[PDB]
Amino acid sequence: IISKSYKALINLVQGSEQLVEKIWYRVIDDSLVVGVKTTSSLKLSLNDVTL
Amino acid sequence: MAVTEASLLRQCPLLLPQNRSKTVYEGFISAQGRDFHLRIVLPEDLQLKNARLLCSWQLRTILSGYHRIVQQRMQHSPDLMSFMMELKMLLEVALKNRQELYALPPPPQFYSSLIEEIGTLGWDKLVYADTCFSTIKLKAEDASGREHLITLKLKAKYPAESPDYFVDFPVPFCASWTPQSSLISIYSQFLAAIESLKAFWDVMDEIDEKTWVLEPEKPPRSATARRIALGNNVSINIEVDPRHPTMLPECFFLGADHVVKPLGIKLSRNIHLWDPENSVLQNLKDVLEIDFPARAILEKSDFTMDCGICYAYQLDGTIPDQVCDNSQCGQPFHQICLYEWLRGLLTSRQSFNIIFGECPYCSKPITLKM
Amino acid sequence: LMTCSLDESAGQKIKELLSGIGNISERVSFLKKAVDQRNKALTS
Ligand SMILES: [Zn+2]
Ligand SMILES: [Zn+2]
């Protein structure tokens, strides 16, 4: 029930393509550093991505 | 809430709008600790005049012969809110009628705690436990060596609430049930009730062995009255006080009015010669200056001690008691039979709540006092 | 094929059934709590 009733939420908001390859994270001193590589899909000449 | 934005959620938590236009609700409805499926599609506007209401096949089973009631409710109902209030009220009704499907025990409390408390008693006691473990029956002995049973009926929570305690003996049984009290508590109470009657049971067993008991036949432990027969065609009915059994009981005489007179008269002379050191029988034999016969039952197996109007013993609790004041007839009758006889005839003449008439068999004066 | 014509030991067997009741009732409580989980997840 829950699986479908949630799935419907996604259809509210939307109504495939992996835009972001992969997520990794390291630590410098006191300093968490999350980062991610793109796919040729997400152009930053045209789009203003945050994280 | 007033609005069914919030009142819908607050009354039906489990109703989730799938479609954006809140038009398909789905998910569940709550009902007597039982949630069920529901898939309730509205039209392109909010109208229940047209609505699809589909179910679990489980839900179709429980809305057996209310298919039409709820179809009415859909077309006459204003809002979806009100519909759900009604559909809940209605499920509660359907299930409370079908109330023979319910009740799972708490196994961590019950089965063990019950095995524990029966261990507390001892295993020699238990005589019956139902396969639902709802009923059990226990045994105790008197100081005399008489078996006295106690039936218990148990709830889903035995130690919380009182178990229903059923037991034969005549004075009303009282069980101080606490949630802390157990099978051993009520068992001690049961033994206490047994011994307060210990002298009483002995007096009754004594009467039942040595005298022609008539009118309880295999008496229970609940009987305090004992219709003894003496000679033939006269009887004595005896109610005994259970706390003072050896002491003088209220006793009186049935039969032919010429036979009862000297017996009553000699009881009035010799009632001060009653003594509570002897038994009830060892005081009655010296009070009335008689013996009792030992079961004139087996020799007089058909003397026709039946009404001789209707020819039955046991008409509606009543016994053949009213007799003829005649040596040659001695025919017993019933209150109902003799009254419907002597009122029907011409010859019969009534003073106030008495009828004088002729005995049916011998045509001699017979008197009936209602 | 067969044909049917129709019409110490208790010491340990009490305990074994009591162990089953323990096991069973334990997992009954477990599934009750997964039900409260799902039920809330559903509410919110
Ligand atoms: Zn009769
Ligand atoms: Zn007569």
Q: How far apart are CA B292 and CA B285, in angstroms?
A: 8
DSSP calls for B135-147: EEEEEEE-TT--E
Helix axis angle, B198-210 to B280-287, nearest 10°: 50
Q: How far apart are CA B210 and CA B198, in angstroms?
A: 19
Chain B / chain C CB contacts < 8 angstroms: 28
- In what order do the strands lie in the sheet containing B52-54? B15-17, B24-30, B35-41, B52-54
A13: closest CA of chain C, how far (Å): 17
Helix axis angle, B183-196 to B110-121, nearest 10°: 40
Give which of B17, B30, B22, B25 is closest to B59, Cα–Cα.
Answer: B30
Query: Inter-chain contact A5–C38, Cβ cutoff 8 Å?
Result: no
Q: Which of C12, C17, C42, C43 to mutate to test the interface with B (most CBs of B within 10 A)?
A: C42
Token code pair at residue B24: 């398909």
- Between the CA of B296 and the centroid of ligand 2 the distance, in Å, is 23
Neighbour tally for B327: CB within 10 Å: 8
Q: Is B112 helix (H, G, I), strand (E, B) or coil?
A: helix
Give which of B247, B231, B240 is closest to B293, Cα–Cα.
Answer: B231
Chains that touch C (3 or more CB pairs under 8 A): A, B
Resolution in A: 4.2
Q: Which residues contact B25 (CB under 8 A, 6 or more apart)?
A: B15, B16, B17, B18, B38, B40, B80
Token code pair at residue B225: 């009255």
Q: Which residues contact B60 (CB under 8 A, 6 or more apart)?
A: none
- Between the CA of B259 and the centroid of ligand 2 the distance, in Å, is 15
Using the CB atoms, write b or e for A18-43: b if 16+ within 10 Å: eeeeeeeeeeeeeeeeeeeeeeeeee
Q: Which of B34, B38, B112, B118 to mutate to test the interface with C (most CBs of C within 10 A)?
A: B112
Q: How far apart are CA B149 and CA B141, in angstroms?
A: 9
Q: How far apart are CA B210 and CA B202, in angstroms?
A: 12
Q: Using alpha carbons, list the distances in angstroms from residue B323 to B51, B184, B299.
A: 81, 53, 21
Element (H, E) at B365: strand B365-369
Chain A residues interacting with chain B (CB cutoff of 8 angstroms): 1, 4-5, 8, 12
Query: Inter-chain contact C21–B111, Cβ cutoff 8 Å?
Result: yes
Cβ distance B38 to B15 under 8 Å? yes
Nearest chain B residue to C44 by CA distance is B13
Q: How far apart are CA B140 and CA B260, in angstroms?
A: 42
Question: Which chain C positions have a beta carbon within 8 Å of B13's beta carbon?
Answer: 39, 42-43
Residues with C-beta atoms within 5 A of ion ligand 1: B 307, 309-310, 315, 334, 337
Cβ distance B48 to B80 under 8 Å? yes
Q: Which ligand is nearest to the CA of B360?
A: 2
Nearest chain A residue to C37 by CA distance is A2
Cβ distance B118 to B183 under 8 Å? yes
Cβ distance C32 to C26 under 8 Å? no
Instruction: Report long-range pairs for B146-155 (Cβ below 8 Å, ≥24 apart).
Output: B146/B201, B146/B205, B148/B190, B148/B194, B148/B221, B150/B186, B150/B187, B150/B190, B152/B183, B152/B186, B154/B114
C5: closest CA of chain B, how far (Å): 26
* A9 Cβ under 8 Å from any chain C Cβ: no
B110: closest CA of chain C, how far (Å): 10
Q: How far apart are CA B231 and CA B254, in angstroms?
A: 12
Q: Is B366 helix (H, G, I), strand (E, B) or coil?
A: strand
Question: Which chain C positions have a beta carbon within 8 Å of B14's beta carbon?
Answer: 39, 42-43
The partner residues of A33 in beta bridges, in order of sequence, read A26
Looking at residue B290, the DSSP 8-state letter turns out to be: -
Query: Inter-chain contact B28–A4, Cβ cutoff 8 Å?
Result: no
Query: Inter-chain contact B13–C43, Cβ cutoff 8 Å?
Result: yes
**How many Cα neighbours within 13 Å face the side chain of B246?**
9
Element (H, E) at B310: none
The amino acid that residue A38 corresponds to is: T
Element (H, E) at B278: none
Query: Inter-chain contact B18–A1, Cβ cutoff 8 Å?
Result: no
Q: Alpha helix locations (H) across B226-320?
A: 257-270, 280-287
Cβ distance B209 to B157 under 8 Å? no
